[PDB]
Scaffold this active site. Structure first.
Site, PDB file in Angstrom:
ATOM      1  N   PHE A  61       2.588   9.610   3.363  1.00  0.00           N
ATOM      2  CA  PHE A  61       2.952   9.579   4.812  1.00  0.00           C
ATOM      3  C   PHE A  61       3.123   8.006   5.118  1.00  0.00           C
ATOM      4  O   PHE A  61       3.787   7.941   6.192  1.00  0.00           O
ATOM      5  CB  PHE A  61       1.879  10.219   5.676  1.00  0.00           C
ATOM      6  CG  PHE A  61       0.323   9.547   5.254  1.00  0.00           C
ATOM      7  CD1 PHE A  61       0.163   7.942   5.756  1.00  0.00           C
ATOM      8  CD2 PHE A  61      -0.728  10.088   4.550  1.00  0.00           C
ATOM      9  CE1 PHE A  61      -1.186   7.443   5.566  1.00  0.00           C
ATOM     10  CE2 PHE A  61      -1.737   9.322   4.110  1.00  0.00           C
ATOM     11  CZ  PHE A  61      -1.995   8.020   4.673  1.00  0.00           C
ATOM     12  N   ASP A  62       3.030   7.295   4.406  1.00  0.00           N
ATOM     13  CA  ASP A  62       3.234   5.659   4.534  1.00  0.00           C
ATOM     14  C   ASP A  62       3.528   5.075   3.319  1.00  0.00           C
ATOM     15  O   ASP A  62       2.539   5.222   2.147  1.00  0.00           O
ATOM     16  CB  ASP A  62       2.296   5.201   5.621  1.00  0.00           C
ATOM     17  CG  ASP A  62       2.844   3.717   6.093  1.00  0.00           C
ATOM     18  OD1 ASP A  62       2.189   3.088   6.938  1.00  0.00           O
ATOM     19  OD2 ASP A  62       4.159   3.695   5.953  1.00  0.00           O
ATOM     20  N   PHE A 114      -5.439   5.920   0.100  1.00  0.00           N
ATOM     21  CA  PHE A 114      -4.523   4.656   0.015  1.00  0.00           C
ATOM     22  C   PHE A 114      -4.998   3.712  -1.191  1.00  0.00           C
ATOM     23  O   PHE A 114      -6.003   3.571  -1.668  1.00  0.00           O
ATOM     24  CB  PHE A 114      -4.974   3.701   1.221  1.00  0.00           C
ATOM     25  CG  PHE A 114      -4.620   4.250   2.327  1.00  0.00           C
ATOM     26  CD1 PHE A 114      -5.395   4.823   3.264  1.00  0.00           C
ATOM     27  CD2 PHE A 114      -3.435   3.892   2.789  1.00  0.00           C
ATOM     28  CE1 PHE A 114      -4.872   5.559   4.688  1.00  0.00           C
ATOM     29  CE2 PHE A 114      -2.865   4.378   4.155  1.00  0.00           C
ATOM     30  CZ  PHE A 114      -3.620   5.057   5.132  1.00  0.00           C
ATOM     31  N   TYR A 145       0.909  -1.269  -0.055  1.00  0.00           N
ATOM     32  CA  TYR A 145       0.016  -0.055  -0.178  1.00  0.00           C
ATOM     33  C   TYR A 145       0.840   1.238  -0.222  1.00  0.00           C
ATOM     34  O   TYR A 145       1.893   1.485   0.339  1.00  0.00           O
ATOM     35  CB  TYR A 145      -1.060   0.081   1.167  1.00  0.00           C
ATOM     36  CG  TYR A 145      -0.174   0.310   2.611  1.00  0.00           C
ATOM     37  CD1 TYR A 145       0.456  -0.869   3.189  1.00  0.00           C
ATOM     38  CD2 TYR A 145       0.082   1.739   3.070  1.00  0.00           C
ATOM     39  CE1 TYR A 145       1.144  -0.628   4.243  1.00  0.00           C
ATOM     40  CE2 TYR A 145       0.709   1.607   4.273  1.00  0.00           C
ATOM     41  CZ  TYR A 145       1.225   0.466   4.880  1.00  0.00           C
ATOM     42  OH  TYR A 145       2.246   0.718   6.145  1.00  0.00           O
ATOM     43  N   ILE A 170      -6.855   1.236  10.670  1.00  0.00           N
ATOM     44  CA  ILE A 170      -7.762   2.061  10.919  1.00  0.00           C
ATOM     45  C   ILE A 170      -9.218   1.515  10.235  1.00  0.00           C
ATOM     46  O   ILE A 170      -9.322   0.500   9.607  1.00  0.00           O
ATOM     47  CB  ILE A 170      -7.397   3.508  10.083  1.00  0.00           C
ATOM     48  CG1 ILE A 170      -7.069   3.033   8.635  1.00  0.00           C
ATOM     49  CG2 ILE A 170      -6.448   4.304  10.609  1.00  0.00           C
ATOM     50  CD1 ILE A 170      -6.956   4.295   7.584  1.00  0.00           C
ATOM     51  N   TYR A 173      -7.754   8.909  11.002  1.00  0.00           N
ATOM     52  CA  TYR A 173      -7.031   9.360  12.136  1.00  0.00           C
ATOM     53  C   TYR A 173      -7.814  10.409  13.077  1.00  0.00           C
ATOM     54  O   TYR A 173      -7.267  11.020  13.988  1.00  0.00           O
ATOM     55  CB  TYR A 173      -5.671   9.555  12.141  1.00  0.00           C
ATOM     56  CG  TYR A 173      -4.813   8.234  11.884  1.00  0.00           C
ATOM     57  CD1 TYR A 173      -4.422   7.487  12.641  1.00  0.00           C
ATOM     58  CD2 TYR A 173      -4.460   8.238  10.314  1.00  0.00           C
ATOM     59  CE1 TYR A 173      -3.579   6.423  12.394  1.00  0.00           C
ATOM     60  CE2 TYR A 173      -3.763   6.967   9.908  1.00  0.00           C
ATOM     61  CZ  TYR A 173      -3.470   6.109  10.963  1.00  0.00           C
ATOM     62  OH  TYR A 173      -2.671   5.019  10.544  1.00  0.00           O
TER      63      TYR A 173
END
Length: 118
Positions: free
Chosen positions: A46-47, A109, A36, A66, A92
Site C-alpha cells: 500500500f506504500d 512495514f 520503507y 502512525i 489506521y
C-alpha cells in the site's frame, strides 16, 4: 518477533533483519530519514518510499506517523533494517485508510533507518 510496546500488549512486534551500528537511537525531537515498504498481511503493498526513489523524513515522537512507527523507529540504530507487525490500534484503526487499507488491518512495514539529526 519481539513485542516492543510498553506493556507488551501485542500491538507492535519487531524482527530485526539487519543489525545497525552501535546502541545510540533517535529520540523525540530528532528528524529521521528512512526507506520503507508497507504491505498488508496477504502481501498487498500500500506504500513505499523505495518505489518513489526518495527517502522519507519525519520528526520522531510527535505523532506525525502512525503510533506503531513512533514506537518502532525509536528502537532502531543507524543502518538497522527491521520488520514491524503493527496491529490496527497502532495503525489506521477501525476506519482503515482507503483505497487499500481495510479497517482492523495488521500492517507489515520493513524499515531501514539511514540517519537522523536535530
Amino acid at each position: 518477533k519481539i513485542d516492543i510496546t510498553p506493556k507488551k500488549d501485542g500491538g507492535v512486534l519487531k524482527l530485526i533483519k539487519k543489525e545497525g551500528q552501535g546502541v545510540v537511537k533517535p529520540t523525540t525531537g530528532t528528524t529521521v530519514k528512512v526507506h520503507y515498504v508497507g504491505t498488508l498481511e496477504n502481501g498487498t503493498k500500500f506504500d513505499s518510499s523505495r518505489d518513489r526513489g526518495d527517502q522519507f523524513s519525519f520528526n520522531l515522537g510527535r505523532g506525525n506517523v502512525i503510533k506503531g512507527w513512533d514506537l518502532g523507529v525509536a528502537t532502531m540504530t543507524k543502518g538497522e533494517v527491521a520488520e514491524f507487525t503493527i496491529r490496527s490500534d497502532y495503525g489506521y484503526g477501525d476506519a482503515g485508510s482507503p483505497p487499500k487499507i481495510p479497517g482492523g488491518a495488521t500492517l507489515i512495514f520493513e524499515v531501514e533507518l539511514f540517519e537522523w539529526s536535530a
